[PDB]
Design a protein around this ligand. Structure first.
Ligand SMILES: *C/C=C(C)/C=C/C=C(C)/C=C/C1=C(C)CCCC1(C)C
Length: 137
């Protein structure tokens, strides 16, 4: 469908656990967990072109991409990567990430807008998956 709008988080699973297995220090995890709970997500979708802004008190990021065209962003733990998004289905996109420098866990994310109007974001590092669900304001 159309993902454009302001999205508020209603459910999360395994966020701290994802950070923990990525090596994020416990004091920083507490800060990020509290920030993720209050995050604001703005999306502007224009066909295959996406602008996504994720805002919190400690971390704010803008992501710009077109499906099928490589772009640069960061992993969850802050490492620069090259990314490529593809449609897995009509409603779900998948992003594969490759570090610009060095080696690390295989990281990825997915975003799906359900028929319910729920936006489901998953973030993965190797075998560990975090899921966050949003609804449109
Ligand atoms: C398609 C939607 C995407 C790719 C959203 C990505 C959002 C993040 C990688 C958010 C990361 C955060 C942290 C790394 C700590 C602060 C809290 C968050 C959730 C904003």
């Amino acid at each position: 469908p159309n993902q454009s709008g302001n999205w508020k988080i209603i459910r999360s699973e395994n966020f701290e656990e994802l950070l923990k297995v990525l090596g994020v220090n416990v004091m920083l995890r507490k800060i990020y967990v509290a920030a993720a709970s209050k995050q604001a997500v703005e999306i502007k979708q224009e066909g295959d072109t996406f602008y996504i802004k994720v805002s919190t008190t400690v971390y704010t990021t803008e992501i710009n991409f077109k499906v099928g065209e490589e772009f640069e962003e960061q992993t969850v733990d802050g490492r620069p990567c090259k990314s490529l998004v593809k449609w897995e289905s009509e409603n779900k996109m998948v992003c594969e990430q490759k570090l610009l420098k060095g080696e690390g866990p295989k990281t990825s994310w997915t975003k799906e807008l359900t028929n319910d109007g729920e936006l489901i974001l998953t973030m993965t590092a190797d075998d560990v998956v975090c899921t966050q669900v949003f609804v449109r304001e």
